[PDB]
Amino acid sequence: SKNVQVFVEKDAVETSFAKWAQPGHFSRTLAKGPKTTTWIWNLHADAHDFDSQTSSLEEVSRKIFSAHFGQLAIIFLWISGMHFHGAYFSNYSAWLTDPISIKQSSQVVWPIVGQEILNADVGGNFQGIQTTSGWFQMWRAEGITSEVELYWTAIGGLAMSAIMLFAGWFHYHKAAPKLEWFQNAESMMNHHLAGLLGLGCLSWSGHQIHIALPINKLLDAGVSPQEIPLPHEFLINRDLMAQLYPSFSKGLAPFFGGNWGEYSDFLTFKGGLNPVTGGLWLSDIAHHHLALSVLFIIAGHMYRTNWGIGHNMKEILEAHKGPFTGEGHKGLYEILTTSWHAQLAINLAMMGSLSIIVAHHMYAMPPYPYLATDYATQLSLFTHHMWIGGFCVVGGAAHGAIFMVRDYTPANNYNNLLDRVLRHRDAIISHLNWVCIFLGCHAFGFYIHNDTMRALGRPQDMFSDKAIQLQPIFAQWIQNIHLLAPGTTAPNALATTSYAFGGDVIEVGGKIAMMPIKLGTADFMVHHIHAFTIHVTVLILLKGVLYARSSKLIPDKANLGFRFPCDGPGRGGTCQSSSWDHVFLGLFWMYNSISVVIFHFSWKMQSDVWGTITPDGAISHITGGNFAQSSITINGWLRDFLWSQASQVIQSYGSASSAYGLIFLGAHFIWAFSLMFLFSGRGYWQELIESIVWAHNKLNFAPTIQPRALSITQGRAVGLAHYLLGGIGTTWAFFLARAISIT
């Protein structure tokens, strides 16, 4: 009948604790029982690989839907806890009254073992750990005002968490959807693009227009939080709103009529940052979401469902083919509607890419009240979202490779774009290799050249703004374009989207919130290094996807799998030739890439933006503008950045920042610890274990689960894990400790 219908099987899986007591039930091999320690590790590594646990897409699909509900439940509990801790263990009320002086804190340590030192004198007759997630600013923007409200949102969160968990159980054990239900992309997109995003934005705009905007205006004006009317009061008494925004008097009459102009009071396109709080005007944010909402809702009506009108994605994809691309995009629809791994690849890459964009756009255009001046929170958020993004992007590549090895079928892909790509893979990889070498030699060479020149007493031969100069002309041009846009290419706007492009210095509390950021030779040099790092990462990852099934060296790599240790010592050596290993190596380069980016942000900002400005025009940046002539050499980074900005962590003992010092050291230890897994091999360890077991046997006792050394692949994984934790952890402490002081 209808193309789109709901098909669900009742009572699919019985709920019992029997399987719980039978570890390894999901796998046929593991189910037999443990005979060596490898079984234990394999149990945990194959837990969520449903494709290998079952051969039916319906079953795999059912598990994924329910598992997702589980994650949602966890996320809800997390958010709930944060709000609760902000209601019972925080100084929000005090901060709300004096946001500039009091420091945000929402965690308190018990008075055990001198750990109390960690409870700092943040302010407002309160002692606790200074948090840096930015909760206080967000709550202020929403218009919380009280701590009772925080408690209630916490309760809502707990309730929501439970509902999600029930949903997971219900849709797996009692009402499990069939495969036909899952395979309805057009419907899903229509619903998710119009309901989840469109209605979501519209609903949020409602809160912002009726509750947040009015309260925040009063707060900024000076009204004491206790004197601001309760949220419900604004919703009921239109007169009160009319006082603040003199258009609510007209009511919704202007809206139904075409006179949307009358609502210019609260819907505006001002641009720039609020002078008092140093954040984007909420009026603009309200119009933003309202506009986006309309767009999303309209977009949700593009695909056919059950009424004839609409587009069928298959047709659109197949029609787009050209002279240089054979059958074009034929075959892609089936792939994306019959392979979860393929979908995850695209979705995961885009999600990670978004996080990176959020990081850039959220510092240049501060979105929350009193966020820019809080340097600690700004740095924390930028770095956090930069990392999340990197991991996700690499993950997308990984799952893309899993697709090629597990779901790719030659029959369904003849002369399509995918086939043609795999037919000239040598050309693609060869060229990218060259691009990477070119960029790397030229970009890093600049730094080495400068180091040598400065050391040889020849400063006039360096690539600097005072010698041979490499100016970023293109970027400088775009900046000017964006600066002059308000009033020209953007006539109805009133100010620059960001003061970074150009403008005046916005200061809040004697501290600089935003200032024009200029680009010179040093910036050129660093930006091109970023390009090199990203390009190399792509090379490793793309090579893995393209050569996943076969290679000149190992023609039958596909049969070996996605995660095999090697093929042997032959052919000169075939170690680490799997696609999994390419992901393994890619993560190391992603670490390098992101590390450089976050360091660039930290030094540039502390040198050319952040700081204090006097009543008159005197700007004193935190580091003093050293970036221009010091970041052009490697010695400069080691001395004027790492060595100098690390004075805080190393001298944190005896203070509330002591934890960071300990973690800094601990992270270094873990990083080094990992190098033993990354440089050694299973053979040595297995033999050592044999001798150790001899001792236990000599005393008449030994485990039946014979002790064995970690697999080759696991060894690499353990090493990478500790390596990443240690490296990121070290910077984490370094940044946070430094930031607390600079703030």
Ligand X SMILES: CC1=C(/C=C/C(C)=C/C=C/C(C)=C/C=C/C=C(C)/C=C/C=C(C)/C=C/C2=C(C)CCCC2(C)C)C(C)(C)CCC1
Ligand Y SMILES: CCCCCCCCCCCCCCCC(=O)OC[C@H](COP(=O)(O)OC[C@@H](O)CO)OC(=O)CCCCCCCCCCCCCCC
Number of residues that bind ligand CLA (CB under 6 A): 89
Least CB distance to ligand X at residue 207 (A): 7
Report residue 135 CA to chain centroid gap.
17
Least CB distance to ligand Y at residue 424 (A): 9
Q: Which one of 8, 32, 78, 684 is in contact with ligand CLA (CB under 6 A)? A: 78
Is 566 marked as a binding-site residue? yes
Q: Which does 153 bind (CB under 5 to 8 A by kind): other proteins, ligand CLA, ligand X, none?
A: ligand X
Least CB distance to ligand Y at residue 328 (A): 5
CB 270 within 8 Å of CB 360 = no
Least CB distance to ligand CLA at residue 495 (A): 23
Identify the sign of the CA torsion 488, 492, 493, 494.
Answer: positive
The pair of three-digit structure tokens given for residue 720, joined into one six-digit string? 């990478």
Residues 6+ apart with CB under 8 A from 313: 185, 186, 303, 333
Cα(424)–Cα(428) distance, integer angstroms:
7
3-state secondary structure 464-508: CCCCECCCCHHHHHHHHHHHHCECCCECCCCCCCCCCCCCCCEEE
Cα(128)–Cα(106) distance, integer angstroms:
7
Q: Which does 229 bind (CB under 5 to 8 A by kind): ligand Y, other proteins, ligand CLA, none?
A: none
Cα(247)–Cα(301) distance, integer angstroms:
33
Under the criterion CB under 6 A, does residue 322 sit at the interface with ligand Y? yes
Under the criterion CB under 6 A, does residue 333 sit at the interface with ligand CLA? no
Is 685 marked as a binding-site residue? yes
Residue 34: other Cβ atoms inside 10 A? 16
Residues 596-615 that bind ligand CLA (CB under 6 A): none
Residue 484: other Cβ atoms inside 10 A? 14
Is 399 marked as a binding-site residue? no
Under the criterion CB under 6 A, does residue 331 sit at the interface with ligand Y? no
Cβ proximity to ligand X, 205 vs 577, nearer residue: 205
Query: What angle (nearest 5°) sits at the alpha carbon of residue 390, between those of residues 386 and 396?
Result: 145
Cβ proximity to ligand Y, 309 vs 427, nearer residue: 427
Distances (CA, A) of 691 to 133, 244, 685, 700: 50, 81, 10, 15
> Could you give the string, one character per residue 18-37, with x where binding to ligand CLA holds by CB under 6 A and - elsewhere?
-xx-----------------
Is 139 marked as a binding-site residue? no
Q: Which does 322 bind (CB under 5 to 8 A by kind): ligand CLA, ligand X, ligand Y, none?
A: ligand Y
Is 676 marked as a binding-site residue? yes
The pair of three-digit structure tokens given for residue 240, joined into one six-digit string? 């009160």
Q: Which one of 433, 550, 711, 741 is in contact with other proteins (CB under 8 A)? A: 550
Cβ proximity to ligand CLA, 80 vs 607, nearer residue: 80
CB 27 within 8 Å of CB 53 = yes
- The Cβ-side half-sphere exposure at 176, using a 13 Å CA radius, reads 18
Q: Which does 196 bind (CB under 5 to 8 A by kind): ligand CLA, ligand X, ligand Y, none?
A: ligand CLA
Under the criterion CB under 8 A, does residue 301 sit at the interface with other proteins? no
Least CB distance to other proteins at residue 522 (A): 12
Cβ proximity to other proteins, 198 vs 565, nearer residue: 565
CB 123 within 8 Å of CB 133 = no
Residues 278-297 that bind ligand CLA (CB under 6 A): 290
Cβ proximity to other proteins, 516 vs 561, nearer residue: 561
Q: Where are the alpha helices (DSSP H) in 192-301?
A: 200-207, 213-221, 231-236, 238-244, 253-256, 282-299
Closest Cα partner for 544 from 529, 571, 563? 563
Residue 133: other Cβ atoms inside 10 A? 14
Least CB distance to ligand Y at residue 418 (A): 12
Q: Which does 5 bind (CB under 5 to 8 A by kind): other proteins, ligand Y, ligand CLA, none?
A: none
Identify the sign of the CA torsion 384, 386, 389, 393.
Answer: negative
Under the criterion CB under 6 A, does residue 691 sit at the interface with ligand CLA? no
Q: Which one of 19, 320, 442, 466 is in contact with ligand Y (CB under 6 A)? A: 320
Least CB distance to ligand Y at residue 51 (A): 30
Under the criterion CB under 6 A, does residue 324 sit at the interface with ligand Y? yes
Cα(37)–Cα(551) distance, integer angstroms:
34
Cα(128)–Cα(120) distance, integer angstroms:
5
Q: Is 683 exposed, middle or buried (0-12, 13-18, 19+ CB in 10 A)?
A: exposed
Least CB distance to ligand CLA at residue 44 (A): 5
Cross-strand pairs, 508:
511
Under the criterion CB under 6 A, does residue 65 sit at the interface with ligand CLA? yes
Under the criterion CB under 6 A, does residue 256 sit at the interface with ligand Y? no
Is 575 marked as a binding-site residue? yes
Under the criterion CB under 8 A, does residue 434 sit at the interface with other proteins? no
Binding-site annotation: residue ranges for [4Fe-4S] cluster: 566, 575
Where does this chain bind ligand Y (CB under 6 A)? Answer: 320-325, 328
Where does this chain bind other proteins (CB under 8 A)? Answer: 323-324, 326, 410-411, 413-415, 419, 422-427, 451-452, 454-457, 461, 468, 549-550, 552-553, 555-556, 559, 567-572, 574, 629-630, 634-636, 638-639, 643, 646, 650-651, 653, 661, 665
